[PDB]
Each structure stands twice: as C-alpha cells, then as structure tokens.
RNA sequence: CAAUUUU
RNA sequence: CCGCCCGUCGCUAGUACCGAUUGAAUGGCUUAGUGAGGCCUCAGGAUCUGCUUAGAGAAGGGGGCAACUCCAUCUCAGAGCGGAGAAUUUGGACAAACUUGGUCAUUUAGAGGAACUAAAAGUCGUAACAAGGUUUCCGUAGGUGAACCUGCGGAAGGAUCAU
RNA sequence: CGCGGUAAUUCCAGCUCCAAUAGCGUAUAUUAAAGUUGUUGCAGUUAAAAAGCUCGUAGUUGAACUUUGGGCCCGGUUGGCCGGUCGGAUUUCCAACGGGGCCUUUCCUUCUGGCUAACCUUGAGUCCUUGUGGCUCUUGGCGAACCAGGACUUUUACUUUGAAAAAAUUAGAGUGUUCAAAGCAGGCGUAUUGCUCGAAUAUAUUAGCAUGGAAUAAUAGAAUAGGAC
RNA sequence: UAUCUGGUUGAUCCUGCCAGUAGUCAUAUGCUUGUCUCAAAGAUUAAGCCAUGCAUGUCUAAGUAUAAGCAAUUUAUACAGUGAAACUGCGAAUGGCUCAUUAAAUCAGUUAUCGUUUAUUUGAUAGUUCCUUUACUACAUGGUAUAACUGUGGUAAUUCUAGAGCUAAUACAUGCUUAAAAUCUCGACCCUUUGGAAGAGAUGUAUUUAUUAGAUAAAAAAUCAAUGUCUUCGGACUCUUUGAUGAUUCAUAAUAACUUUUCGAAUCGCAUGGCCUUGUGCUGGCGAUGGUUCAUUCAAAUUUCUGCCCUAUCAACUUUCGAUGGUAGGAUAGUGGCCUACCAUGGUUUCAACGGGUAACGGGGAAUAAGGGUUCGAUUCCGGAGAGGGAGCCUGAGAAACGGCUACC
RNA sequence: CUCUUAAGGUAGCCAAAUGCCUCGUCAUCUAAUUAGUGACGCGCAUGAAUGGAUUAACGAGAUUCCCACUGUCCCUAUCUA
C-alpha cells in the first residue's frame, strides 16, 4: 500500500503539491521482508504483469564462491557481523547485501586438500600427476589461511535475499577482508 | 486508460484509408498487427471501399469464413487483420491476385497481378540479432523472422522472402545507384532511387533523394526503403510510376478523358 | 455519438439600418427582376463579397505564382461557365471590377423570359 | 566533493562486475572499466589515473548519454558532486512583436574527472533519471574564461 | 465708511 | 444681477462601513490523542486426507493338520511424518473516522452607532461668480450656529506683462 | 435629447404610410463601431494626467572601425529581333538579371587509409578526319569529386529551404445533391460479364531537428607573452 | 465587407463619456407560424437525491455429455444428430456519462527506455527428464474429488443457501518411454614414466551468484621457460578465431554451484492410406488447443525541452513530520528521497519564487473582422479525472475497477 | 427675543461605587438569570487639576463567566494520635 511516485513529496521549491488522482496499482511498494535464519520458509508471491518472486524468511544455506576457480559450494550460514548501513540487522540477524557473514569454512578444505594438499594448518594412478600439474601456487594469502586456523570463514553476500530467495554471495577475498576488519573492530 | 483501447471511431482513424466520414458510427480498427500501426489497412476495407466485391459489413466475414481469400497462403481467419506494405493477398485463380504497394498521392493501391511474381516478398531488416544457442537470425519488418541469413553483411537493407520459408534468395545492398521507394510521410511512395549516402552521424538519420524529373525531395530514414535497382525493379508497380505530377501539370493532363 | 455536420450562413447584412437610396435602389431592382425577398439581394451580394474576398488576395501576390496561375486561372473559368464575366475580359481584373448585381440576370427567372413566354418577370 | 582515501565512508566503493585476481602480481592491479559515450565526446585522461568510483559517473558508471545536448554556464558548486547550470532564452509574444529573455536553472550531476569553478561555459547531456531532480550529467567542461592564471596585479 | 433677498 | 449659487438645520426613502456577542457555520493546513478496516508477518493447529512398521477392538484367510496371524483385521492407530489447513491471535505498514486547539480563506446574524446618496425644495444666513462689495486660491494651525474667519508661507489661475 | 398644463406631427385609439419578412421585438454578456487600453495607434496647461528635486542596482537602451573592389569564366529564368502562323519548337546572338566557380598577397578546413579519378599520367598499340583527334593493358601520378576516422572546431541571436505540426475546422480544385447549405461522388459506352477518371492542394506561430546564408547585432580569443606555427 | 449619427451652449469649436448601430455555431422570453433537406437539447444553480425497468455476456468439426430432454435409425450395444442446466476457457479493465477536484499540475508539440512489463495477433522454437541409469512398472495411457445432478431442510425474506448419494477434464497433483558423436570430472590396468583406458557421472531450458571471452593504428630481433608437426633432422612454421551500436559489464558462448524444482502434449477433429513379417506389427496426413524463450504488435509506465488568467491590500518560501544532494540497504515489473540508516547543508526567488482567487478540466477549435487584437471552448475529436465523500484490497495480462469486495462517514 | 442673582452643562461619560421611580428598555450570557457585559439618555442629583475621558504592567483591592481539580454537596463511611 506504500506509494512510490512523487505526487506527494513537496517539490524543489517548497510548494505543497496538489495531490490527487487516487492511488493506483502501477505505483506499489510492499512491506520489507527481513529475511532471517531458521530453516527455509521462502514464501512465494505473485507480482505485476503475471510474475512470481521470492521473499525469503529463515534461510540457512547458500552457495558461496571464490571465484577464480569457481567452487560455489553450499555452506552453512551462521551469523552476520557487520552491515555497512543499518546497525540493527546485525543485532536482529537479518541479512541483505554486504551484511557479511561468518559461515562454516569446512566444505572448502575438503576441496582445497583434494588437489593441493598443503595441508592446513596446524594414492591414485595419477595422484602426483594430478597434484604436480596444478602445483606451484600452493600459497593463498596470509590473512586467508589464518582464518581457517579458527576454521570458520567470512563470506560476502551478493544476491537480493527477499526478492529472489537465495542469499548467494562470494568468499570475501582480495584485500576486502583487510578492509572490513578495520570497519569491524573500530566500533568506538 | 485501464487497459488497451478496443473501439475506434470514424473521424479518428487514419485518413489515408480514404474511409467515409458521415455514416454516423464507429470505424474498423485492426487486431494486434503483425507489422505496422494503422498505416496498414484491414482487409475488410480493401474489398468494399476499393475492390467493391461486397457492399456491407459481415458479408466480408461470409467470404472470409469460407476458405476463399489466401494471404501468404493462409486463409487469415481474423476478419479484420492488417494488410500492410508490400504484402500479397490472393483470391481464387485466373488473375484475381494483388500486392499492396503505395501510390504517389496517398491512396493505397488497386494492383491486379498474376500468381507468378506473387511467389516472393521483398522485405527490410529492422534489426539483426544473434539469439539463443549462439545461433544468428534476423528480423524482417513484416513481423516475420528468418533463420540463417546470407550472413555477415548488413544492417538496414532489403531482403527477398520467398513465401515458402525463410529463404534468403537475394539480398541487394544499400547502394548509391539503386532504386529506393520511400514509405510514408508527405512524400509517401513517389520514387527517388538515390542521390547520396548521408548519415548525419551521431544523432539521427536522413537521406537526400532526387526523383526522375530532378525535384530533390529529402526524406527521413524510417520512411525510406530500398526496393530495386535503376531500370531493374524487382517488384513491379502500377501506372503512376512515382513522378509526383504536380497540380499545374494535373490541369491539362486530365484534358484527355472527355473524348470530345 | 455522430460526427458533426457543418452548416453555414449564406448572406451578410450591411452595418447600416436606414439609407434613403439603397432601400429604393433595391426596389429599382426588385421590380426589375420580380424578387420576393431581400434575403436574396443579400445572398447574391454574398457571392460578390466572397468572389472579391477570393480575388484581391490572389492579386496582391505576384505574377508567376503557384496559386495564381492555378486558381486565378481556375476561378475565372467557373464564373464564365455561367457567363457573367464577359467572353473577352478573362484577365481576372474585371472580376474584381465585376458589374454590380450581374450574377442574378442569368438566374432562370429571366432566362425563360428572354425566350418570350411570359410578358413579365413577375410572371417568371 | 571528496578525495584523500576515496573509501572514506563505511561501505566499500568498488565497480560492479570487475575483479582482479589475487594470485600473480603485475603493475596495473585494477582493470578499471572505462568507455566512451559517443557524439564526439572524447574522455579526459584524469578519469584513468584517478581512483574514484562514484557509480553515476558518465564514463565509468552504468549509465550512458542518451537524449539531447544542452549548454549553459554554472552557478553553484557548494554541493557534494552536483552543480547547477544556468540558461538564457528568449520568449516571443506575438501581441507585441517583441522579445523578452527568461531563464531556468536546472541542476546537473558532475563527474570528478572534471573540475569547475563558477563561470565555466559548459555543455551537458541527458541520462537515466539518476536522482530526485538532477537528470543530466556534464559531459564536456570546455573551461573558457578571461583572466585565468593571468592576474598578477 | 457702511448694502440683505428677489422659487 | 429682480442673475445664479454655497453650508448647517428640519422632512422622506435608501446604500455601504464600525459593532458586545470570548459571534456562528463550511473548506484547507497543521498540536496531541483515540483509531475501524484491509494487507504483510511472528504464531495457532479445530477439521480433513494419505503412506509405512504392525498389533489390537479381529480374522485379512498362503489352505495349511494345528503353521506365519502373508494380510491392514471395521478403528484405538503402539508409533512415525507428513500434507491441506479454518476459529481466533502476534508485530509492522497503509491508514478511513472523530476530538482537541491554533491559523487562514468564503458566506451569514446582530442591540446600536456615526457617514453619504437622492430628493415640492422649506428655515437660517450670504460664502462664491464683477475690485461678489475684506482680491480669490493652496499647505498647516486655531476657532465657531453653518457657509465661514483669522494667523503664517507661497502662487497669479488677478484688478498691474509698464520708471 | 424630450413630449403631456382642451389647438399632443410622440399618450390612447381609427385611416394611411414605412421597415424587415415566417420571421420580428424584448433582456443579458460579448465583439466591432472604441485611434473610449492605443505594438501597428493615445493623451499628460485647470482640462484626466510630468513625481518637490537628486542618487541608485536590477530591467531596458546603448558612437564609429576589420574582404572592399577590380577583372575573368560558365551554364540557368523571363522576353525578344524570331511564328516561320498550326495564340507550338527557337535555328544564332541580344536585352534585364539572378545562380555558381576562379584570379589579383586574397582557396572554399586539415592528416590517416582504402578507394579513387582527372591523366598534364603517357611504356606504347587502334578504322581514318594527321596514333588520349575516334579507342586500349599500365607506372612519379589534376585525391578527403566517396566513404570512415583524426587536429575537432568562440558561442549565439536572425533568416530561406525541409521531412514535422492526427482526422474533422477554414480557403478551396472537381462533381447538375433540382439550385442550395451539403456530400465525395460520379462519368462513359453494348447499357448482354463492360469499360473508367476520382477523392487533391494550403496556410497551420512559437519549442525541438537538418541544411543553406554571414549583412545586422551581442560573444570570446596574444601584453610581465605561459601566443599558434 | 476599412463608413458613423442624436445629447452640454444664446450660437461655435473640442476632449470626454451617455445613447443609438450590425453579428453571435449564445442563452432566455414574447407575439406569430404554410412547405423541403440538415437536428442542438437538465453544461450553467445542486458532482443534489432517486420509484421502476433495461445498459455484459459468450460454443465450435475441434474441452465434459447417463437431461429416465428432443427427434431419431442404420455404420457405430464404448455415445455416435443436437442440446437446457452445468464445470472449464475468455471477456466483463472496452464502450457510455459528466467536468467536481485540478493553474509548470494536467495538457499541446517534440524526444528517451543503454531504465521496464505485456494476455492477445504473426513468425521463429524443445530427441540431453531416469537419480540404485535394467525395481524407477501403465507409457498399448495412472490417481483424485468436487460440480450439474438425485433425494431429503431452515428462514417471510435476497442472485443466502445443509448434511447425504455418485460423477468428468485442456481443473488438480503426479509420472516415464525415443539417434549417434563431443568435452570435462574421477581412475580398473599402467610400473612404464614424452602414455593409454574398462567403468561411473554430467550433459536441454529456466533460476541466482561469482568469474572468462565478446578482440581489431605500423614493424623486428634478442632474452628465459612450457614448447610442438615434419625432418633436408642445427632446421621452416604453427596458418590465431568476431555480430552490432555513436557508446555498454550489450546480445551471445563458456566455468562452478544451486532451485520446496522452471519447462519439455497423459488434449480433442476429419480421413483413413503405405511394407507383408496377417499382426492392437511398423509408418503416415490435415486441423484446432496450449506451452518456455526471442521477436513483432496492442499497449502501459516513467522522463528531456519549451509553452499556461488575475494578485504584491501576498516578498521571502522549504528542512526537527525529507526539504536539497551523496554512500549503502530495502521496496519497485522497472530508474530515482520511493522508503530507511548515516553523512553533508543545501535548493527557489522581483526574469514575480512562496501564498491567495477563479462565476478554470487542458488541447484540437469558436465568435467577431482591412491589418494588429479581444473574449471564449461544459460538450460531437485527442488526453486526464470521478462514479455519494474518503481510505484499503482479491482475482486478473491489464483495476485501487466501483452496472467487484471490505471498513468508516 | 425674554426673566432671575453674571452665566446657562461644551468636549465627554453613565442605571457606573453617583438613577428615587427601578428587578428602567434593548440585545448577548443561562435550561432558567434583581447578578455580569455591550449599547440608549430629559442625567431626582454626572462632567472637566472640587480634574474629565483611555490606559500596557502591578494588585494578600472588589466583582461575573469558562477549563482543570476536588467529601463543600448527593451520602456519608473508616482509621490514626
């Protein structure tokens, strides 16, 4: 029932706009969904024109990718730690974009050891041939291996949770996990 | 508002249908067209305004519901249906066969042709597109789309559809030395064959054009349409021949119909 | 509903009620032709108005002009088709200088009296 | 109007759908996505070596100059990344066979690859409706004024 | 030096 | 010039304006409240309908010599784990409606007050038009039955274009 | 404006006459008449109107000057001396110009290419009227005579042209709707398969768009030279 | 078809008004009325109230026929022609009325979607579905559980309808069956190391994320390394692929994963034919129906520029109830202060912003006329709005619908 | 114009704390109003430094009405010292 055009909302001077022509259907905007955790109640809706979108509630698992290899494996989603705009969804466990989450980190080192074999971090007929081939890049980065030391990883988040259901982000890689920790710790 | 219009009055229709003003009532409007806006014409108004093979309304449906008139082969079960530019409608055999090409003035046509040369269209690309599966097609302008054209040449050029399937049989390049045929506007359907390859680059397109008798008339791109080559033309035309014989020449040329 | 249908006036009264000669110069004409009503003497002047409405504006424009050599050659023909302009003065300037109340003596009240038959125009 | 640690606020400004691989190190390190918009509008080079993001820049953001091209001179500069242009035009009323000159001063989005004082005879394009009222973006500054780096009295 | 009215 | 004409005062019909009432109503915008409904949403789980393990409240009967109860044996299911789910309820958002005031805008009621208009033109005077009998007009001040008068400083539209 | 106070050319009536005509009067707004709202086009001594004078930013209004001339060269429009008659063609040139391109210091952008091209390129070859005089394979070569990219350009005001200004509305061309206001019909034979022209055209401001024009105006480009080349 | 005349005075000239004068496709009234074609008509004030009726329903060759309906009777003992009532399907969002609100709002002209949705019309368009990949059995075809109906109720009510007996599908939820190659993931055998493969899995389409390509102004040696075909065996050379825009992270293909799994005929009509291996063998035409996507069309929604009557006895207006911008989030079909969190303090304006009034819906146009203009347009066409006054909302491709629903007045 | 002792209440204001007749008359206030307020003046007997008229603030000054509050009251009851 929330309108979203500007036949209300006083214009660039200050003129109290003549508001009229009773509100219509091509004008709509719905209640914010506030997706949560708690095992998959993603409730389907109709939309305009003959359409069908996905407003999630209580999701727990979504494929999070690296992606310079493109792994995209399903991971257990655990807890939001920092949202860049709204400091209430960190405390009410809602998630949208850049509400970057700790997850589980375990379905990655089953894949990581599967052809690298570091191991981190304290034989088939071509086992060395499938390990010497994609070798000489066994180091990843200092601050990324040292998060597998605790064994739970910070994923970023990219898909829109309450408009397509799935929260489908990426492994927060690069120096961006040397960026959010400055915005993480400095809440003072 | 609240949805599409579906009723259309007289004295609100296009005037180039040359439709009547004073019957006291509404007008034909087409369905969802294949090709154009109502710069097409319904095939209702073709056979009681210009052909006069009927004389009142639903007797157009009486011929139409009984397999008589073939349009591009198919009977075209919708009684009002757009018969736009270039299209071939055909009746029974022995020379009842037509084609829909503009004259000079603004009427559409009465263009009696044979069953031969009515075995192929001559279209125009609006857009080329390489759609799904990585496989290219093209979009000709009568609503159709044809698959695997004679490839890697053009946008904005003619094509020769062949009334069986897709069938690129002759694409003819957008040349200076050419026979072009402008479709629409105040300069609708004369002929001006070319003069020059303008683009007016960046913003918007326009093409300078000269006629047979050296009256340069200059048109928009969206009106202009290639149809042949100098002296050649593929689709033949009626007795008007595209001159725009003006009124101070209309005065004494019409002095030959009295017989006295 | 229905598309509109036009209807016009066909005369134009003078802006003067009472002049002591034109209310008799009409009757120097009214007995001269046997006309029943001065609506008609306004009606034939309405053409003599609108002919010279149509003729002065074709002449303030130039020689060799794409309406004057079409319509100024065409307007003279339709009124010599009746024959009220003479068969020598086709140059559209004796159309502006057309005779006063000259259209109405080729009304066939007095085109049937010139073939005898009445011994009046009141009989016409 | 900001610089000096471009990622100054609490969200991380970086271009969508671009990425630099953390594996092998080279000298360029950020494949920035730039382009040209057409109508003979050739980009300034300060767009390249600069490291701003600001999603509604015309050469880097996901917009394109689409409609018409206007002109005018700039009045204000006191906002974060927006300025207002000034226009002068003459409306003719046929009752008097005379003119009169009006004005309308629309706002227009600015790109940090440029730089503008007040003055600055400038030309703008048309964009997607990027904000509340500002719908145009400056596309070529043509910085032209008298007494520029010239006063020494 | 001082002077009012004439339906 | 026995010309005209000015004001008060009286006689009659009018028209606006001011007006105590904490005037009144209508419309709009806002102070703080109450807030029906519908939608979303945290819940709830009457009420149905299935499948499976298989007893029982019973035979479904592989035809066995008595078997295993193969089966479902009406429905308690001993269970499971569903699935559709109302009556109500939970927290948002939109919010009709109403009060409360303040502020505007539009119309109206008023006891009464002073103005002006029109007017058989009456009473009191003569102000003006002539040097109108004190030259007339303007600004300001004072006075008085009423025109009017007196100062004061101008101007001639004056009764002088003149030492 | 005035008539009527027992002589009414106005009242009330008769007879006559006059207007307009199946229409006429009355009332109310509004247009012209209104040069009584005035841009084209007003007055400013009591007449109605010039501030008591002066300063003053907007708003208007703003002196003059920069490619003129001169010559060359081409084809167009109108009309001729030309009808020469079957009021139709101009064989030659002329008359008044208007359109375009050169030269006088005076180009009318520049570079990348592919073209293209004129060949003054010309190695040379061809019926004849004498080997770019009528023709051919090819080079330093009469290149934005055509595309698509560059140096990318002081900016406008103004003005011609042009697709653009829905249909009806208006001026209208054509048509024997009986004429007409209308409407877009109709017309011609063979009236026995039988033909056929039709339904235009036009202003339609300003705002946009394209192109031609460079007078009239504004507008910027060098001065401690950081000036183009 | 550019015109003037009576009134101040004893008579004159002149401003100035009053009056006369013609027209109104502009209203009313009065008197009067014989004929032909063309017809405006409860706009004005009361967007004030309404008795009564009518104004939106629909079926083919093609969705279901147990009507104890109607004819039938000979091609149909599965009906075999229709066809009430009905369930599906579509439409009822169009048309029609009126002009109250509404003065940069609507609207007129001109643009944009590289910022979006689309039932319908027309054209392109599906061998990759199994998850114990021979137990997954119907693919020679599986299950509803409800109608209409049949019979019994209440209430006076109305287009209210109850438990019970059955029942269909293009309604519902399911569920399979068809050609080979190609690469990738593993690894039975390598035990040799310059290599091969049994077998197993995916392989269509949609979804959403992250990533890759989608190139194109001249040339040449040297460097180090993976480094090849052939072998004159030092040696020649790997021929290198590109659609469009003025412009894109564009179309498109690819990598890696998902999905309460998106789709991939369990549908009807007519004619009955072709190989003999005479068997429900195998193979076929022509016609509707619905689908996913890309187009088109009918649209809709936004948005650029410029244009609207009077008033200063309205000069400052708008922001703690977003006013002006930015970074993020949501929400939107779709861009955006649309909404939120925060950060900054803007924006408009004597060229008339803000405010007030309209006996203002805007435009196409009307009347009148020498030219310039004035005053109108409720309304025959285009667009907008409302259905007593405000709000909500289901279905639907399309509605804040009102001859649809709910609440309040 | 006149009389009494000389002059005859001008500006203003009022049933006012000054009006006997009087609970004057009109309006508004109220359900009802000898109260209150605003007007009328021929005022027994107001009225000009015996000062007249209007006043912002300040009244433990005197009055009337409204809102909030409440055992003053309907209707009394209970407890403590």
UniProtKB/Swiss-Prot annotation, chain A:
GO terms, biological process: maturation of SSU-rRNA from tricistronic rRNA transcript (SSU-rRNA, 5.8S rRNA, LSU-rRNA); translation
What InterPro entries does the database record attribute to this sequence? Ribosomal_eS8, Ribosomal_eS8_CS, Ribosomal_protein_eS8_euk, Ribosomal_Se8/biogenesis_NSA2
Which positions bear Phosphothreonine? 61, 106
Tell where it localizes: Cytoplasm
Q: Does the keyword Repressor apply?
A: no
Primary localisation category: cytoplasm
- MF terms per GO, please? structural constituent of ribosome
A further note on this protein reads: Present with 15900 molecules/cell in log phase SD medium.
Give the record's family classification: Belongs to the eukaryotic ribosomal protein eS8 family.
Q: What does this protein do?
A: Component of the ribosome, a large ribonucleoprotein complex responsible for the synthesis of proteins in the cell. The small ribosomal subunit (SSU) binds messenger RNAs (mRNAs) and translates the encoded message by selecting cognate aminoacyl-transfer RNA (tRNA) molecules. The large subunit (LSU) contains the ribosomal catalytic site termed the peptidyl transferase center (PTC), which catalyzes the formation of peptide bonds, thereby polymerizing the amino acids delivered by tRNAs into a polypeptide chain.
Q: What is this protein called?
A: Small ribosomal subunit protein eS8A
Q: Which gene encodes it?
A: RPS8A
Swiss-Prot record, chain B:
Task: Name the principal localization, coarsely classed.
Answer: cytoplasm
Write down the superkingdom of origin.
Answer: Eukaryota
Supply the alphabetized keyword list: Cytoplasm, Isopeptide bond, Phosphoprotein, Ribonucleoprotein, Ribosomal protein, RNA-binding, rRNA-binding, Ubl conjugation
Q: Which residues constitute the cross-link Glycyl lysine isopeptide (Lys-Gly) (interchain with G-Cter in ubiquitin)? A: 61, 133, 160, 167, 173, 178, 210, 232
Localization, per the record, is: Cytoplasm
InterPro entries noted in UniProt: KOW, Rib_uL2_dom2, Ribosomal_eS4, Ribosomal_eS4_C, Ribosomal_eS4_central_region, Ribosomal_eS4_central_sf, Ribosomal_eS4_KOW, Ribosomal_eS4_N
Please describe what this protein does.
Answer: Component of the ribosome, a large ribonucleoprotein complex responsible for the synthesis of proteins in the cell. The small ribosomal subunit (SSU) binds messenger RNAs (mRNAs) and translates the encoded message by selecting cognate aminoacyl-transfer RNA (tRNA) molecules. The large subunit (LSU) contains the ribosomal catalytic site termed the peptidyl transferase center (PTC), which catalyzes the formation of peptide bonds, thereby polymerizing the amino acids delivered by tRNAs into a polypeptide chain.
Describe the protein's quaternary organization and the partners it interacts with.
Component of the small ribosomal subunit (SSU). Mature yeast ribosomes consist of a small (40S) and a large (60S) subunit. The 40S small subunit contains 1 molecule of ribosomal RNA (18S rRNA) and 33 different proteins (encoded by 57 genes). The large 60S subunit contains 3 rRNA molecules (25S, 5.8S and 5S rRNA) and 46 different proteins (encoded by 81 genes).
Name by which UniProt lists this protein: Small ribosomal subunit protein eS4A
The gene name reads RPS4A
UniProtKB/Swiss-Prot annotation, chain C:
Lineage, top-rank taxon, reads: Eukaryota
Which compartments does it reside in? Cytoplasm; Nucleus, Nucleolus
The record's GO CC annotations read: 90S preribosome; cytoplasm; cytosol; cytosolic small ribosomal subunit; nucleolus; nucleoplasm; small-subunit processome
Q: Which GO terms describe its molecular function?
A: rRNA binding; structural constituent of ribosome
Keyword line: Cytoplasm, Isopeptide bond, Nucleus, Phosphoprotein, Ribonucleoprotein, Ribosomal protein, Ribosome biogenesis, RNA-binding, rRNA processing, rRNA-binding, Ubl conjugation
Broad class of where this protein is predominantly found: cytoplasm
Q: Which GO terms describe its biological process?
A: maturation of SSU-rRNA from tricistronic rRNA transcript (SSU-rRNA, 5.8S rRNA, LSU-rRNA); ribosomal small subunit biogenesis; translation
**Job description of the protein:** Component of the ribosome, a large ribonucleoprotein complex responsible for the synthesis of proteins in the cell. The small ribosomal subunit (SSU) binds messenger RNAs (mRNAs) and translates the encoded message by selecting cognate aminoacyl-transfer RNA (tRNA) molecules. The large subunit (LSU) contains the ribosomal catalytic site termed the peptidyl transferase center (PTC), which catalyzes the formation of peptide bonds, thereby polymerizing the amino acids delivered by tRNAs into a polypeptide chain.
Q: What family classification does the UniProt entry report for this protein?
A: Belongs to the universal ribosomal protein uS4 family.
A further note on this protein reads: Present with 106000 molecules/cell in log phase SD medium. There are 2 genes for uS4 in yeast.
Q: What is this protein called?
A: Small ribosomal subunit protein uS4A
Which residues of the complete protein does this chain represent? 2 to 125 of 197
Curated annotation (Swiss-Prot), chain D:
Mention one GO molecular function.
rRNA binding
A biological process (GO) of this protein is: translation
Q: How is it modified after translation?
A: N-terminally acetylated by acetyltransferase NatA.
Tell where it localizes. Cytoplasm
Keywords for the protein's UniProt record, in alphabetical order = Acetylation, Cytoplasm, Isopeptide bond, Ribonucleoprotein, Ribosomal protein, RNA-binding, rRNA-binding, Ubl conjugation
The record's annotation in CDD domains points to: Ribosomal_uS17 (cd00364)
Record field: transmembrane: none
GO annotations of cellular component type: 90S preribosome; cytosol; cytosolic small ribosomal subunit
Q: Which positions are linked by Glycyl lysine isopeptide (Lys-Gly) (interchain with G-Cter in ubiquitin)?
A: 14, 45, 55-56, 78, 95, 104, 132, 140, 147
* Positions where N-acetylserine occurs in the chain: 1
What is the documented function of this protein? Component of the ribosome, a large ribonucleoprotein complex responsible for the synthesis of proteins in the cell. The small ribosomal subunit (SSU) binds messenger RNAs (mRNAs) and translates the encoded message by selecting cognate aminoacyl-transfer RNA (tRNA) molecules. The large subunit (LSU) contains the ribosomal catalytic site termed the peptidyl transferase center (PTC), which catalyzes the formation of peptide bonds, thereby polymerizing the amino acids delivered by tRNAs into a polypeptide chain.
Q: Which family does it belong to?
A: Belongs to the universal ribosomal protein uS17 family.
Query: PANTHER family per the record?
Result: 40S RIBOSOMAL PROTEIN S11 FAMILY MEMBER, 40S RIBOSOMAL PROTEIN S11-RELATED
Spell out the note in the miscellaneous section.
There are 2 genes for uS17 in yeast.
Annotated protein name in UniProt: Small ribosomal subunit protein uS17A
Q: Which organism is it from?
A: Saccharomyces cerevisiae (strain ATCC 204508 / S288c)
């Amino acid at each position: 029932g929330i309108s979203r055009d500007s036949r209300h909302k006083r214009s660039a001077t200050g003129a109290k706009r003549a508001q009229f022509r009773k509100k219509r259907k091509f004008e709509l905007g719905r209640q914010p969904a506030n997706t949560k955790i708690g095992a998959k109640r993603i409730h389907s809706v109709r939309t305009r024109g003959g359409n069908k979108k996905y407003r999630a509630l209580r999701i727990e698992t979504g494929n999070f990718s690296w992606a310079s290899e493109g792994i995209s494996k399903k991971t257990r989603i655990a807890g939001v730690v920092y949202h860049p705009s709204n400091n209430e969804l960190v405390r009410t466990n809602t998630l949208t974009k850049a509400a970057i989450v700790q997850i589980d980190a375990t379905p990655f080192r089953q894949w990581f050891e599967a052809h690298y074999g570091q191991t981190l971090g304290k034989k088939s007929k071509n086992a060395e041939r499938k390990w010497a081939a994609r070798a000489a890049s066994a180091k990843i980065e200092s601050s990324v291996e040292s998060q597998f030391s605790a064994g739970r990883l910070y994923a970023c988040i990219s898909s829109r949770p309450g408009q397509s259901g799935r929260c489908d982000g990426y492994i927060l890689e690069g120096e961006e996990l040397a960026f959010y920790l400055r915005r993480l710790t400095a809440k003072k | 508002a609240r949805g599409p219009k579906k009723h259309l009055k007289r004295l609100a229709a296009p005037h180039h249908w040359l439709l009547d003003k004073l019957s006291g009532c509404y007008a034909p409007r087409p369905s969802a067209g294949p090709h154009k806006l109502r710069e097409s014409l319904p095939l209702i108004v073709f056979l009681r305004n210009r052909l006069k093979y009927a004389l009142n309304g639903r007797e157009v449906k009486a011929i139409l519901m009984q397999r008589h008139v073939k349009v591009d082969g198919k009977v075209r079960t919708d009684t009002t249906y757009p018969a736009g530019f270039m299209d071939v409608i055909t009746l029974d055999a022995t020379n009842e066969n037509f084609r829909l090409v503009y004259d000079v003035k603004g009427r559409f046509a009465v263009h009696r042709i044979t069953d031969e040369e009515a075995s192929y269209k001559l279209g125009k690309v609006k857009k080329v597109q390489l759609g799904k599966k990585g496989v290219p097609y093209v979009v000709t302008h009568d609503g159709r789309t044809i698959r695997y054209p004679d490839p890697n040449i053009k946008v904005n050029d003619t094509v020769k559809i062949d009334l069986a399937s897709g069938k690129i049989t002759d694409f003819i390049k957008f040349d200076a030395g050419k026979l072009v045929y402008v479709t629409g506007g105040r300069n609708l359907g004369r002929i001006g064959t070319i003069v020059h390859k303008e683009r007016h680059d960046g913003g918007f397109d326009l093409v300078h054009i000269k006629d047979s008798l050296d009256n340069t008339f200059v048109t928009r791109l969206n009106n202009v349409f290639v149809i042949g080559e100098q002296g050649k033309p593929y689709i033949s035309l009626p007795k008007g021949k595209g001159i725009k014989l003006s009124i101070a020449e209309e005065r004494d040329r019409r002095r030959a119909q009295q017989g006295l | 509903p229905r598309a509109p249908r036009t209807y016009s006036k066909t005369y134009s009264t003078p802006k003067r009620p009472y002049e002591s000669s034109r209310l008799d110069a009409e009757l120097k004409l009214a007995g001269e032709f046997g006309l029943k009503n001065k609506k008609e003497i306004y009606r034939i002047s309405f053409q003599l108005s609108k002919i010279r409405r149509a003729a002065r504006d074709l002449l303030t424009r130039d020689e060799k002009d794409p309406k004057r050599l079409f319509e100024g050659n065409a307007l003279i023909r339709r009124l010599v088709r009746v024959g009220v302009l003479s068969e020598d003065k086709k140059k559209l300037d004796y159309v502006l200088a057309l005779k006063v109340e000259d259209f109405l003596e080729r009304r066939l009240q007095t085109q049937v009296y010139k073939l005898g038959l009445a011994k009046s125009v009141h009989h016409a | 109007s900001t610089e000096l640690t471009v990622q100054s606020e609490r969200a991380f400004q970086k271009q969508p759908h671009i990425f630099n691989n953390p594996k092998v190190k080279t000298s360029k390190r950020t494949k920035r996505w730039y382009k040209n918009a057409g109508l003979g509008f050739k980009t300034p080079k300060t767009a390249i070596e600069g490291s701003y993001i600001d999603k509604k820049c015309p050469f880097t953001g996901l917009v394109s100059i689409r409609g018409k091209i206007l002109t005018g001179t700039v009045v204000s500069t006191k906002m974060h990344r927006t300025i207002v242009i000034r226009r002068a035009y003459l409306h003719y009323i046929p009752k008097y066979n005379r003119y009169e000159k009006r004005h309308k001063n629309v706002p227009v989005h600015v790109s940090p690859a440029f730089r503008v004082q007040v003055g600055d005879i400038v030309t703008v394009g048309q964009c997607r409706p990027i904000s509340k009222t500002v719908r145009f973006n400056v596309v070529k500054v043509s910085a032209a004024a008298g007494k520029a780096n010239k006063q020494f009295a």
